[PDB]
Amino acid sequence: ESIEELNFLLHRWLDQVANRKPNATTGISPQERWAEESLKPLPLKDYDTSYLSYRKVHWDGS
DNA sequence: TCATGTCAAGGCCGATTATTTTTTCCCCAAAATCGCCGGTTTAAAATTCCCCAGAAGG
Numbered sequence A: 001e002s003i004e005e006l007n008f009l010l011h012r013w014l015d016q017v018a019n020r021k022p023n024a025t026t027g028i029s030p031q032e033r034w035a036e037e038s039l040k041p042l043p044l045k046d047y048d049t050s051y052l053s054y055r056k057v058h059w060d061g062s
Numbered sequence B: 001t002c003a004t005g006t007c008a009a010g011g012c013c014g015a016t017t018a019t020t021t022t023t024t025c026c027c028c029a030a031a032a033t034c035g036c037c038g039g040t041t042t043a044a045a046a047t048t049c050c051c052c053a054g055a056a057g058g
Helices: A003-018 A030-036
Strands: none
Touching: none
């Protein structure tokens, strides 16, 4: 009934089975290969992805 | 070094485990069938005993 609930269930399902079941070709649990991965470090501050609009305040202040 | 399809599930087969049913084996008792031996009966074959004729010897 809520997208937050759906995302929570999806993440739990992934971490339970999807990223735990061994792959049919690599034949190994994805998390072990993840541990083998070497990704570049993240920046401290994330690229701000937020709608930016300019508005005007009414006479009263509303 | 570019760019470059990949993973999961379903179905089928084989092997293993569990449950049920059927068949066999062993031992004991009773009945039936079959086998062997002996005796009896029937049929066929063999041997010995009396009178007629022929042949041989003195």
